[PDB]
DNA sequence: GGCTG
DNA sequence: TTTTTTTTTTTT
């Protein structure tokens, strides 16, 4: 590995600028490698630039080495190539090499300290550190890392953090003006967002509308369905995207020509993403099967999603709980925690839906207290939008969206808003 | 457990088994036998892969063919119940020859330079002055039967390199045969005159200073104060100069048996030698000299610098292990 | 000097009473000495007295030993003999020998640790400490002297206790005088302090405000967030310390010039600590994870916190429990016990958050019987606080704190004090 | 060890008195040992006294055997020396030797019986017992020991039981007249006593008051704390003993002159014990840890406790059940049983505390069914008191200690009695 | 054609993108081939990129291999080279080889099952 | 011509 | 992964 390290010190710039401050003579060897590194360090000190092979050989010629040292250094210099390795592997491997050598040196030093300690006090070296310095020395061996990034350091990462607030690095817009207004620019990555459906509201209509909106904005969407097949969910997606009514597809009003024309028109647009629909049996998909699905999609389909939409939280299974109940609070709390952990670890926006409490069903207003999942969903959910469909709203083709929990912004800023739900095309349109 | 009653009882049980041999050194008790469970090798009728080891806390039988491994008590309970009865009841009851001459052996220093064995030992690059410590024979079974009769049934003429072993007094008590041909029963055939003979080659040549102990007698010929244990019991005790010996084995970092012997030596607080900074890559010092162009005095320079003991030796072994 | 140690253990009452309680079997060797000490230790355990030669070589040596072991033990026992030596030199030489052997054992152990950690996973010999805890082993080996320090004698140790009283070397004062007049000087080092607020009532505004106050007081603060990213928590801290509304940093009413100016104005102050924010997925961090994070911070960033703020106690996991339990009582109690053990081990004030029961939602008063996850959490906490701002305090930007459990003082003295919340700046101000 | 047995039969006296009745010639050997024991037994039968070495030589001379064995016997009586070994070890080893030889003889006898049964009736021996006698004689070899007492007999041992009534030898007074009245002499040794109360009610306060009262009655009190630090418990004890409020210590109203003066005034008392306060991590100590602590306390100092105050048993761990293998009931029952076993082994009064359920935290009356964790803890306890505090009681500095369980007296004579509680001084006073 | 498969996994990108998700360690003989594929798979799992020859020689040195295994892996790595061919014959040949290896493994497994049943 | 755990 | 006892706890 030392040959590679020296070669890419001589014949690289980013690697040099990254690993030079953490490079010491004692890390290499007691033979040709140490002499070559000493030549490199001397040249960089006298001339603040990376030496070339000819300059290195000139320095070796004008240097004080014996015959064996001269031969070793000459052979090692002749054995260095400008080959192109990847930067990440090179940095990680040289970091591991440096750490191993530092640990070996520290262990040898503490062994020598102990050996010197067990010697006649009249007869010992004064320069050798005392035994009490052993725990600190090993610490200096363990404090060797090319790059230190343990968490977010306030007052040490304020310039990077400001670039996050200006660039809105975490926000993902909604394509609906009202939803962008109440989220201060959309939902955030690594979040769990749920919709609460009162009596008479479907949970998959809103999820399909969000999936279509994200698809039109260029995002990779992974729709995991539980109670429905892939074809049915993709048919809801087609209804929203192709403007064809859902019943028109089953009846046969729309022909193959119009369908293919609309699909190719969408394919021509470069602002379109990819939608992958995966079906799982009811209760047969925990938030560990989703990790395997993501791994398979990344490896085989190269599909790395930014939006993950689960059809229904209640139908899912809690991996930690293991046991499965049709409508149990402990499972819903665990499922929410597991899904939010998946969202955080995958840096994706995760969407799901739940049913509101029966009292919430009868009452147009839904309270966090009036929720089927109490203290379990309004504790692990960054955003919880509530959807109310009464007779008067249904007659006007509308649904009252109420904001029950908003980690993003103030919940009471714009709490109630009317949404233009179309149940045929499975779409949400804004209301002026 | 009671080891000597296990040795006594095991012998009778394994005595019935064919190919029964008593491998009893000065400090161990082993019994070689054909395995009664599987009949040992079906193809080879003369193989005895069943073994009994009684030098441990419990005398255990192990088969190297069918992987049977059991205590002697379970073996007696399962196969010899009449012997098993008395075994548990007795359990409850208590609960020198000098090699004076070498016939048909010629020393290498008085041999002619055009001898084919002289060309081989020149190909092994042994220095000339060591050539008076080496003999050559063509009647190796005849020589062994002249020393220890009965080991070779028929004295077919086999050319072998004679390796006499002398004590601290300088008296030959054993001799090893190096196989000149590639096809042989064994690479190194060690023959003793009396069973308590020394197995350390060249003890009479030890001068003052550190004593380097190697694995090959030919390897010790390049080494000043170099002696070599010829396998056997590998007993550190039977090895002299315990205060000042140097423990040199072959260069093999990925070999598990070599690092097992290194771990046994370093756990005993001995001075073990480490090849972790060696410029050469061959297995032994003779192979280093023959194949990598190494001269001996560079090797006398390397080892002295890297002599290790105790805790610092441990880390050297930790990094040399893989 | 094993022979002398054993001989004067057998044939000296004063030496025995002085040195036996500090004797261990891992000090002598891997041969006859260890077996002889095993016999002596077994005899002393069984009969509470020093064995004689007859007891050693008859009542004890007739055991399960190898021939070689039997011969070695017989020779060592026959070699034991009483020798006239001063009982100040014997104790000092024995102490030196014990210290040397402890250092040797520690060096061997850390060598084995490095060798094990160098190996790839699936063969890494679990339960063996990581490379991070090498220096603590050496430090423990250093302090292996023969001094009797078992507990705190009441009469023999009143000087150190009075020094602790006068120095007050347990209190960490708040920046709020109201929280200092009820805690009699702030929270204590080895303690677990809890906030209970509900859903979107606080419970992280309070934790962020406490972190900001501790930062202004020069303390090193470690904010481990399980429900929010590092950037959002740091944004709340920025809103608290820069006197800028949380919405202003999102809409864009604050320029980069004034942001950098305020940050540099805070930097130049010597009375400012370091705040490090680290995020973990919801339900994927235990006390062992926190210990690993602390070790990593100490080694790499040289960061040893005095305040540890876990954003939520109930969405962590138990290190001791191996199989997830649907019973929230045992899991939350175990998590709280592990967190308090970590706090008392690191001598760090540990603040966390707890969720109140749905009954307490929109309730003008919250009792201790309103704790949601577990009733064992209030038993392990050293100081709990409840936030009960229902409807009218929100209109007045107020929050009422009840002081449900107070181990620093009488909770019935100043039960309510009506804290001045500010949600835009995410801070608490007094009503002085 | 036949040489030791014979030597201590000839020379030692108390050993002879204890071991001679359980001695038979079949227990020794069939060689010199049997002959020597036969000579000793013949001499003791002739003259009812232990013979001497010269007497043994005279008996050998006058009563002769065949010279083959006679030489072995005369060389057997050349090694019997005084060798003043400890009595307990000698008795135990002799008992083990005779038990082993009895087992060997019984096995040989049953083997001989089986061999005789196989032989035809024509030539079979008549003295040998039948096969049907094999089990019972084996039992005769199983129940061989030096314990002359197998149990307690009501009529045979009426004496040595009246002694336990005149001198209590179990009662430890309480220093409080009400507790002595309801206990009829105080708590007994080898017992488990529990104070049960809600969270933040006074349990540690009561335990510290009891520890202070015991300390004033010349008792060795060991306070083991699983939650609070040693300094906090010592501060409670100082507040109780030095008549200084807790607020005074944390407000600096007491000078070092007063503190040291009061401490030395207490030291000058000859009626003061020792109070060692030991801290363990929550859930990180068991009964075996307590036994090791007691052993090291006895070794490193002259401290053998008579009172052991465990702060809370619920936060300990069982030394038999693996961690979190069983539910709360089984684990807490096992912990209580282990603590009571420790108490009966050490002959100490063990006080502890337990939590009540969530339903009893705001109740004016506490029943035995309100115990948290196991219901087997009341079964295992010997004396249980319930501490009840309400608003009216807190307004008058009083509590409502109620007898839940009493093996010392009738719980109904004085079931509920008011007790003044000075929380500032952490002291229990009795209303008079 | 294990050597060709390894060579075009290392030195080719379209071939790697096409065939990597379907390759498995069970498709290679227990000699140098399986160990070399283990090194490649570990490198890809740890760095999400195709290793070079230097990376594998570093991974070989930092490995717990016997002398025979080490020599075989080093020889196989030395023998690797980028032979120019067409990215339509390579994919189908690799698919055929993988199918044959899967059939061989299935046959061995069912033979072992039948041997186990008669016990 | 030996070799186990 | 289910099954059954008992307990303790909590949520509705
Ligand atoms: N961006 C924001 N702008 C203004 N107010 C906010 C913002 N984020 C949160 N809040 C307010 O802060 C409170 C929310 O409490 P937090 O400190 O976020 O913790 P929490 O939400 O109570 O914890 P949970 O488990 O998510 S309910 C509410 O009063 C919100 O109105
Ligand atoms: N450090 C302290 N300073 C002042 N008053 C205290 C202190 N500790 C306890 N008290 C008072 O004494 C009461 C009982 O405390 P303890 O007896 O220690 O409680 P406990 O029974 O151990 O239960 P916890 O630990 O509080 S759940 C408290 O409610 C306070 O009124
Ligand atoms: Mg929060
Ligand atoms: Mg307490």
Choose the mutation target among C152, C332, C348 for the interface with D, i.e. most D CBs under 10 Å: C152
Measured between alpha carbons, how far is D382 from D171 in angstroms, rounded to an integer? 13
Q: Can you tell me the distance from the alpha carbon of B121 to that of B128, in angstroms, rounded to the nearest whole number? A: 10
Q: Which two tokens stand for residue A345?
A: 């670890």
Residue identifier of the C-alpha nearest atom 26 of ligand 2: D200
Cβ–Cβ < 8 Å for C146, C98:
yes
Distance CA D122, CA D116 (A): 11
Could you tell me where the DSSP H helices lie in D119-202?
134-142, 163-166, 177-183
**In contact, A333 and A311? CB cutoff 8 Å:** no
Whether the Cβ atoms of residue A136 and residue C135 lie closer than 8 Å to each other: yes
Helices A289-296 + A329-346 axis angle, to 10? 30
Pull the structure tokens for residue A429. Answer: 């349109």
Q: How far apart are CA D402 and CA D390, in angstroms?
A: 14
List beta partners, residue D171.
D188
Structure tokens belonging to residue A397: 């083709």
Per the listing, tokens 């220890």 go with B148
Cβ atoms of D343 and D188 within 8 Å: the answer is no
Which two tokens mark B23? 């491998």
Alpha-carbon span B179 to C45, nearest angstrom: 61
What is the DSSP code (8-state) at residue A307? E
Neighbours of C136 (CB within 10 A): 14
Q: Report in angstroms the alpha-carbon separations of B263 from B236, B272, B317.
A: 14, 10, 8
Which residues does C121 contact at the CB level (< 8 Å), separation at least 6? none
Tokens of B270: 């001995």
Neighbours of E66 (CB within 10 A): 11
Residues in chain A: 432
- Could you give the C-alpha distances from C312 to A347, C227, D150, in angstroms and in order? 21, 7, 60
Query: Measured between alpha carbons, how far is D312 from C230 in angstroms, rounded to an integer?
Result: 38
Contacts of residue D205, Cβ cutoff 8 Å, sequence gap at least 6? D236, D421, D423, D426, D428
* Nearest-10 crossing angle of helices D87-118, D2-10: 120
Stated as kind and residue range, the H or E segment containing E89 is helix E89-117
The closest of B171, B163, B177, B169 to B133, measured between CA atoms, is: B163
Contact D19, D9 (CB under 8 A): yes
Q: Do D283 and C320 touch (CB under 8 A)?
A: yes
Are D354 and D314 in contact by the 8 Å Cβ rule? The answer is: yes
Question: Would you say how long chain C is, in residues?
Answer: 432
| C-beta separation of B10 from B61 below 8 A | yes
Cβ neighbours of residue D276 under 8 Å, at least 6 residues apart?
C150, C151, C152, C153, C154, D221, D222, D223, D297, D303, D305
Residues facing B32 on adjacent strands: B21, B51
Q: Which residues pair with C171 in a beta bridge?
A: C188
Please report, rounded to whole angstroms, the spatial distance between the CA atom of protein residue D366 and the C1' atom of nucleotide G6.
24
Chains that touch A (3 or more CB pairs under 8 A): B, C, E
> From CA B216, how far away is CA B207, in angstroms rounded?
19
Whether A172 and A349 have beta carbons less than 8 Å apart is answered as: yes
- Which tokens in the block code for residue C430? 């007094």
C265, containing H or E segment: helix C256-268
Nearest 5 degrees, angle CA A405-CA A411-CA A415? 100
What does the CA dihedral C79, C84, C88, C94 come to, rounded to 10 degrees? Answer: -10
Planar angle of CA D98, D101, D103, nearest 5 degrees: 110
How many angstroms is it from C201 CA to the middle of ligand 3?
Answer: 8
CA nearest to B203, candidates B249, B161, B231, B240: B240
Report how far residue D317's alpha carbon sits from residue D288's, in angstroms, rounded to the nearest whole number: 10
Paired tokens of B171 = 């008296």
Q: Check the CA dihedral D81-D87-D93-D96 and report its sign.
A: positive
**Residues followed by a break in chain B, C–N over 2.5 Å?**
95
> Could you give the CA distance from residue A96 to residue E59 in angstroms, rounded to a whole number?
12
Question: Bridge partners of A275?
Answer: A221
Burial track D267-303 (b if 16+ CB lie within 10 A, e otherwise): eeeeebbbbbbbbbbbbebbbebbeebbebbebbbeb
| Contact assessment for residue D196 and residue D371, using Cβ atoms and an 8 Å cutoff | yes
Q: Which two tokens stand for residue D31?
A: 């060689």
CATH number of C166-429: 3.40.50.300
What SS3 class is residue A310? strand
Nearby residues of D314 by Cβ (< 8 Å), 6 or more positions away: C379, D332, D335, D354, D355, D372, D373
The beta-carbon contacts of E101-109 under 8 Å, at least 24 apart in sequence, are E101/E26, E101/E27, E101/E28, E102/E27, E105/E26
C-alpha of D319 from chain center:
17
Q: How many CB atoms lie within 10 A of CB A84?
A: 11
DSSP character string of C160-177: HHHHHHHHTTTEE--S-H
Q: Which chains touch D (3 or more CB pairs under 8 A)?
A: B, C
Any idea what DSSP says for residue A50? P
Q: Which segments of E20-88 does DSSP mark as H helices, in order? A: 32-47, 53-61, 67-79
Query: Which residues on adjacent β-strands are paired with residue D276?
Result: C153, D222
H or E segment to which residue C8 belongs = helix C2-10
Burial (0-12, 13-18, 19+ Cβ within 10 Å), A88: exposed
State the Cα torsion C36-C38-C40-C45 to the nearest 10°: -170
* Cα D113 versus chain centre, distance: 45
- Assign D37 to helix, strand or coil: helix
**Min Cα–Cα distance to chain C from B319, Å:** 8
Torsion of the alpha carbons at A157, A160, A166 and A169, rounded to the nearest 10: -110
- Bridge partners (DSSP) of residue A279 are A225
Please report how the helices D287-300 and D328-346 are oriented relative to each other, as an axis angle in degrees rounded to 10.
Answer: 30
Inter-residue contact D404 to D385 (CB < 8 Å): yes
Q: How many CB pairs under 8 A join A and B?
A: 14
Is residue E87 within 8 Å of residue E15, measured between CB atoms?
yes
| Partners of A307 in beta bridges | A221, A349
Q: In D, which residues are within 8 Å of C49 by CB distance?
A: 86, 88-89
* Among candidate residues C287, C290, C273, the one with its CA nearest the CA of residue C221: C273
Residue A383, beta-bridge partner list: A193, A406
- Measured distance CA(C242)–CA(C229) in Å, rounded: 20
Q: How many CB atoms lie within 10 A of CB B27?
A: 12
CA A293/CA A312 separation, integer angstroms: 17
The token pair at B173 is: 């008590």
Cβ atoms of E49 and A86 within 8 Å: the answer is yes
Q: String of b and e for C377-392 (b: at least 16 CB within 10 Å)?
A: bbbbbbbbbbbbbbee
Contact A346, A192 (CB under 8 A): no
State how far the Cα of D185 lies from the Cα of D180, in Å rounded to an integer.
5
In DSSP terms, A416 is beta-bridged to A402
Task: Let me know if B41 is exposed, middle or buried by CB neighbors in 10 A (0-12, 13-18, 19+).
Answer: middle
Q: Which ligand is nearest to the CA of A382?
A: 1
- Are C39 and D81 contacting, i.e. CB atoms less than 8 angstroms apart? no
Task: Determine the Cα angle at D158 with ends D157 and D163, to 5°.
Answer: 100
The count of other CB atoms within 10 Å of the CB of residue A94 is 23
Return the structure tokens found at C243: 């006197």
Tell how strand C307-310 and strand C221-225 pair up: parallel
N residues, chain E: 119
Q: Across chain B, which distance is largest between two alpha carbons, in Å?
A: 70
In terms of DSSP bridges, do strands C152-153 and B307-309 run parallel, antiparallel, or are they unpaired?
A: unpaired
Collapsing DSSP states into helix, strand and coil, what is residue C227? coil
In 3D space, the residue among E35, E14, E13 whose CA is nearest the CA of residue E25 turns out to be E35
Closest to B142 measured CA to CA, from B134, B150, B131, B130: B150
Provide the 8-state DSSP code for C368.
G
- Give me the sign of the Cα torsion angle C158, C162, C164, C168: positive
- Residue A411 structure tokens: 């919940």
φ/ψ of residue A88, rounded to 5 = -65, -45
Experimental method, per PDB record: cryo-EM
Contacts of E70 in chain B (CB under 8 A): 254
Distance CA C41, CA C25 (A): 9
Structural class in CATH, domain D177-430: alpha beta
Alpha helices (H) in A306-367, listed in sequence order: 329-346, 358-362
* Nucleotide whose C1' lies closest to the alpha carbon of residue D326: G7
Q: Is the C-beta atom of D423 inside 6 A of ligand 2?
A: yes
Q: How far apart are CA C216 and CA C239, in angstroms?
A: 14
CB atoms inside a 10 Å sphere around CB A248: 14
- Residue the block writes with tokens 């979107």: C200
CA B140 to CA B149: how far, in whole Å?
12
C185 touches strand G (CB under 7 A): no
| SS percent in chain D: helix, strand, coil, step 5 | 45, 15, 40
CA dist., res. C31 & res. C26, Å (int): 11
The finding on whether C6 has its CB within 6 A of some atom of ligand 1 is no
Among D102, D92, D105, which residue's Cα sits nearest to residue D18? D92
Cα separation of C147 and C142, whole Å? 13
Task: Mention the CATH class of domain A167-429.
Answer: alpha beta
Q: Characterize the bridge pairing of strands C383-386 and C192-196.
A: parallel
Residue found by looking up tokens 């501490």 in the block:
D387
**E17 three-state secondary structure:** helix
Q: Work out the number of other CB atoms within 10 angstroms of the CB of residue C430.
A: 13
DSSP conformation class of D362: T
Touch of A by B (3+ CB pairs closer than 8 Å): yes
Hey, what are A33's tokens?
Answer: 């490698």
Most distant CA pair in chain A, distance: 105
**Considering only CA atoms, which of D355, D339, D307 is closest in space to residue D208?**
D307
Backbone angles phi, psi at A66, to 5 degrees: -80, -175
Are A332 and A368 a contacting pair, CB within 8 Å?
no
Percentages (nearest 5) of helix, strand, coil residues in chain A: 45, 15, 40
Contact residues on chain B for E63, CB-CB shorter than 8 A: 322
Q: What's the burial of B246, exposed, middle or buried (CB within 10 Å: 0-12/13-18/19+)?
A: buried
Q: How far is CA A408 from CA B178, C114, C210, D121, in A?
A: 84, 46, 21, 102
Resolution of the experimental model in angstroms, please?
Answer: 3.2
Closest CA to A408 of A389, A379, A381, A369: A381
On whether the CB atoms of residues A223 and A307 are closer than 8 A, the answer is no
Instruction: For residue C298, give the DSSP letter.
Output: I
Q: Flag if E66 and B252 touch (Cβ within 8 Å).
A: no
Structure tokens at E87: 């990215």
CA distance C98 to B182: 57
Assess whether the C-beta atom of D236 lies below 6 angstroms from ligand 2: no
SS3 A317: strand
Rounded-to-integer distance, Cα C235 and Cα A171, Å: 14
The residue in chain E having the minimum alpha-carbon distance to the alpha carbon of residue B257 is E66
Cβ atoms of residues A88 and E47 within 8 Å: yes
Identify the residue whose tokens are 């509590």. Answer: D399
**Phi and psi torsions of D235, nearest 5°:** -70, -40
- Quick one: which of E16, D235, D164, D273 has its CA closest to C162? D235
Closest CA to A161 of C229, C202, C243, C423: C229
> Is D394 in contact with D235 (CB distance < 8 Å)?
no
């Amino acid at each position: 590995m030392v040959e590679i390290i020296l070669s890419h010190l001589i014949f690289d710039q980013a690697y040099f600028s990254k690993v030079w401050p953490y490079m010491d003579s004692e890390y290499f060897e007691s033979g040709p490698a140490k002499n070559t590194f000493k030549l490199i360090k001397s040249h960089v000190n006298e001339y603040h630039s990376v030496p070339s092979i000819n300059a290195l050989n000139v320095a070796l010629e004008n240097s004080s080495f014996t015959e064996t040292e001269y031969s070793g250094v000459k052979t090692l210099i002749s054995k260095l190539a400008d080959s192109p390795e990847d930067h990440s592997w090179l940095v990680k491997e040289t970091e591991k090499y440096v750490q191993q050598r530092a640990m070996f040196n520290a262990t040898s030093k503490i062994i020598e300290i102990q050996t010197n300690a067990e010697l006649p006090p009249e007869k010992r070296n004064k320069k050798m550190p005392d035994v009490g310095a052993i725990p600190d020395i090993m610490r200096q061996a363990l404090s060797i890392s090319f790059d230190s990034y343990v968490g977010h350091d306030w007052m040490d990462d304020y310039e990077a953090r400001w670039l996050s607030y200006m660039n809105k690095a975490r926000k993902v817009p909604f394509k609906l003006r009202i939803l962008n207004k109440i989220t201060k620019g959309g939902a955030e990555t690594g979040t769990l967002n749920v919709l609460m459906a009162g009596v008479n509201v479907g949970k998959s209509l809103g999820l399909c509308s969000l999936a279509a909106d994200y698809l039109q904005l260029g995002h990779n969407v992974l729709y995991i369905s539980m109670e429905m097949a892939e074809e049915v969910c993709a048919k809801r997606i087609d209804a929203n995207m192709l403007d064809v009514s859902l019943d028109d597809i089953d009846d046969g009003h729309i022909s193959y020509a119009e369908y293919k024309g609309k699909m190719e028109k969408w394919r021509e647009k470069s602002t379109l993403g990819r939608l992958i629909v995966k079906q799982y049996p009811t209760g047969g998909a925990d938030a560990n099967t989703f990790r395997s699905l993501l791994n398979e999609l990344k490896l085989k389909k190269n599909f790395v999603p930014t939006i993950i939409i689960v059809d229904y939280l209640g139908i899912c299974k809690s991996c930690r709980i293991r046991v499965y109940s049709e409508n149990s609070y402990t499972t819903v709390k665990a499922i929410a925690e597991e899904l939010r952990a998946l969202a955080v670890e995958t840096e994706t926006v995760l969407w799901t839906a739940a049913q509101v409490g029966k009292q919430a069903w009868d009452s147009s207003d839904v309270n966090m207290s009036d929720i089927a999942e109490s203290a379990g969903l309004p504790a692990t959910a960054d955003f919880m939008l509530a959807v109310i469909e009464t007779e008067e709203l249904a007659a006007a083709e509308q649904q009252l969206i109420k904001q029950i929990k908003s980690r993003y912004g103030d919940k009471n800023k714009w709490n109630k808003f009317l949404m233009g739900v179309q149940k045929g095309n499975q779409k949400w349109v804004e209301i002026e | 457990s009671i080891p000597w009653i296990d040795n006594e009882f095991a012998y009778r049980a394994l005595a019935h088994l064919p190919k029964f041999t008593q491998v009893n050194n000065s400090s161990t008790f082993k019994l070689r036998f054909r395995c009664p469970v599987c009949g040992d090798s079906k193809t080879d009728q003369n193989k005895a892969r069943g073994w009994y080891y009684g030098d441990n806390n419990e005398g255990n039988i192990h088969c190297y063919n069918c992987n049977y491994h059991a205590p002697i008590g379970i073996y007696l309970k399962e196969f010899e119940p009449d012997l098993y009865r008395e075994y548990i009841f007795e359990i409850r009851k208590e609960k020198k020859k000098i090699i004076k001459s070498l016939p048909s052996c010629v020393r290498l220093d008085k041999l002619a330079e055009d001898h084919p064995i002289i060309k081989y030992v020149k190909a092994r690059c042994i220095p000339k002055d060591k050539w008076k410590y080496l003999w050559f024979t063509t009647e190796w079974p005849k020589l062994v039967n002249s020393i220890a009769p009965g080991t070779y049934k028929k004295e077919i003429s086999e050319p072998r390199l004679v390796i006499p072993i002398y004590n601290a007094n300088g008296k030959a008590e054993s001799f090893q045969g190096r196989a000149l041909k590639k096809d042989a029963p064994q690479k190194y055939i060690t023959i003793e005159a009396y069973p308590e003979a020394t197995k350390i080659y060249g003890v009479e040549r030890v001068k003052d200073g550190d004593v380097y102990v190697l694995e090959g007698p030919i390897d010790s010929l390049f080494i000043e104060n170099g002696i070599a244990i010829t396998g056997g019991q590998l007993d550190l005790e039977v090895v002299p100069f315990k205060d000042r010996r140097v423990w040199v084995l072959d260069n093999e970092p990925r070999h598990p048996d070599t690092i097992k012997r290194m771990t046994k030596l370093v756990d005993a607080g001995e001075r073990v030698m480490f090849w972790d900074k060696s410029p050469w890559k061959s297995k032994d010092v003779n192979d280093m000299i023959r194949k990598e162009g190494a001269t001996p005095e560079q090797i006398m320079e390397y080892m002295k610098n890297n002599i290790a003991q105790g805790l610092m030796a441990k880390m050297r072994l930790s990094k040399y292990a893989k």
